[PDB]
Design a protein around this ligand. Sequence first.
Ligand SMILES: CC(=O)N[C@@H](Cc1ccc(O)cc1)C(=O)O
Ligand SMILES: CC(=O)N[C@@H](Cc1ccc(O)cc1)C(=O)O
Ligand SMILES: [Cl-]
Ligand SMILES: [Cl-]
Ligand SMILES: [Cl-]
Ligand SMILES: [Cl-]
Ligand SMILES: [Zn+2]
Ligand SMILES: [Zn+2]
Lengths: 305, 305
Amino acid sequence: SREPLLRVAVTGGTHGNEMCGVYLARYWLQNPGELQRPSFSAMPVLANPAATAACCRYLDRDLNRSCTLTFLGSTATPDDPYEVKRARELNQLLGPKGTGQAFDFTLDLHNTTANTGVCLISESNISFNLHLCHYLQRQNPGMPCRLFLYEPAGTETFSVESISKNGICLAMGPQPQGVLRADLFSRMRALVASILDFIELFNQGMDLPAFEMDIYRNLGSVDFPRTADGDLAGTVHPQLQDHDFEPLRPGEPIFKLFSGEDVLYEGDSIVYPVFINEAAYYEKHVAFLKSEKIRVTVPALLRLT
Amino acid sequence: SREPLLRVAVTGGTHGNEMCGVYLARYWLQNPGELQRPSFSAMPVLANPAATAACCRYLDRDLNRSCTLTFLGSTATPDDPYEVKRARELNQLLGPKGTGQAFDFTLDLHNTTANTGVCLISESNISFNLHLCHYLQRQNPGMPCRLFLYEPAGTETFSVESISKNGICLAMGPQPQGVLRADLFSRMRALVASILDFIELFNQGMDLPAFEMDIYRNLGSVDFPRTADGDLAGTVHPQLQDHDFEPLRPGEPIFKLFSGEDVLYEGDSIVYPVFINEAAYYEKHVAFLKSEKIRVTVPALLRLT
Ligand SMILES: CC(=O)N[C@@H](Cc1ccc(O)cc1)C(=O)O
Ligand SMILES: CC(=O)N[C@@H](Cc1ccc(O)cc1)C(=O)O
Ligand SMILES: [Cl-]
Ligand SMILES: [Cl-]
Ligand SMILES: [Cl-]
Ligand SMILES: [Cl-]
Ligand SMILES: [Zn+2]
Ligand SMILES: [Zn+2]
């Protein structure tokens, strides 16, 4: 039968300049009462302390790309990237990744400079995660809450939340890095509260009926237009800017070059752009991710068969 | 009679993560033709090369606070802040500050994460600068173009543009640091073109009739609410957020504390908040600047008496 989630973490500041999670984590470390439910208490964690102190995404390496078994399992060294060192600590705290000692669930908080609104990023189609999203949607009529299915292309998962048995990322934008907006802070805070409510209901044995829902599944990235030297030759087109999750159709403009020309989408199908013009993605060569919108059937989670 | 402005510079990337100026400066260095007018050609300059390369505001010290006579005149040292070293180079290029060798005019380009729209920041009430703003307003009906008079409180001016005999800052927001928006890029680009048009007209001997206009004069800053340790205890209130240049009246809410309480403005007069929730200003302890809106009379600039 159903195993309750008793070891639950909420991580903020995985990227040190994403301010909602930074300040929620700091606040809850001073005031943990908010994270307590009848069946469990969630542990708040500031994921990247040094980056947070410096208010930057990362010091040496992206922490949210440093949690592969290869990194975690490798022999230490004084000259290791700071974030590799910190990944190993999180592995001790919340893992070890891939063993029975790992936490039951980690909720990881993110901001984006893209106009995403509320987005749950899941690295698998695990039905619990889809039920969680569905619950948030129903708790918030008229507020988009979208599930972005981002399955790792490589061999190894790499994210902070992947350390635990299961987990999910709550991402909210748009918000400039290093800026804390009251509106996003409060909303993220209430959504976390609701996610903890959900886990509590689950722990109490609530039946979650099977249902269908639309999700967005990652197809790949499109890079900024570049010169031969890889310097920007333009940026996201005004008609694409801020239109995350909206249909992008072949023939439609996606970039405006500095020379004044328009670049058109040359794909065969309508896709759904996500994370359009994210500051942190310039160096990753990503102007946006392409996703396909798909209707999936989510099995029931019942206490008994 | 009238002295024409023949040595004119446009500086971008004074802060390395403010993307319009960074990319305009880089573009114009490759394609200077755009900066040429019949009577003069403006020199594009990337003000902070190392910060720009790292995409950060500054390395050691804010370049736009490093151009005091004290810094510029002090004896060099290997252990000098990078930006102090670079300030001295700009002093060689565009100055020396306070001598007859200085450039006639420097236009310095900025972005802000605050919802300022188009703002010209002037460090004095020099009539040329007010005529320039008035010209931009008339060239752009229905587009706010506001003059922010920011006279240095201290003894010494400190900004990159203060190196020249005269100058002004063109600031545009909102834009996240490290993000280039097509819309702001194009608009800043056209406004620069118009500013160069203005200088050309001036050089040709055009009479500029006296006129009146509203400007915004700096009164001082209000800091974020803090704990005894100086950590944020809250942020800009949702009703104040994004309302730059709008009236702020005593009794109105300016902050939302994490504890949930509202903080009200306690001033005696209606003021006009500017640079509300700028990322770079957190460390400067500035949540917003207070300004007074004043109608001033601008004398004529005529070719002859
Ligand atoms: C803007 C940002 O940091 N986005 C996150 C979103 C994300 C990506 C992959 C994940 O596995 C989880 C979250 C990231 O790139 O790390
Ligand atoms: C966001 C930002 O960098 N604003 C500028 C605006 C500014 C301030 C004072 C000046 O003298 C000129 C521009 C700054 O603080 O340097
Ligand atoms: Cl459900
Ligand atoms: Cl966007
Ligand atoms: Cl005029
Ligand atoms: Cl603002
Ligand atoms: Zn992030
Ligand atoms: Zn600036």
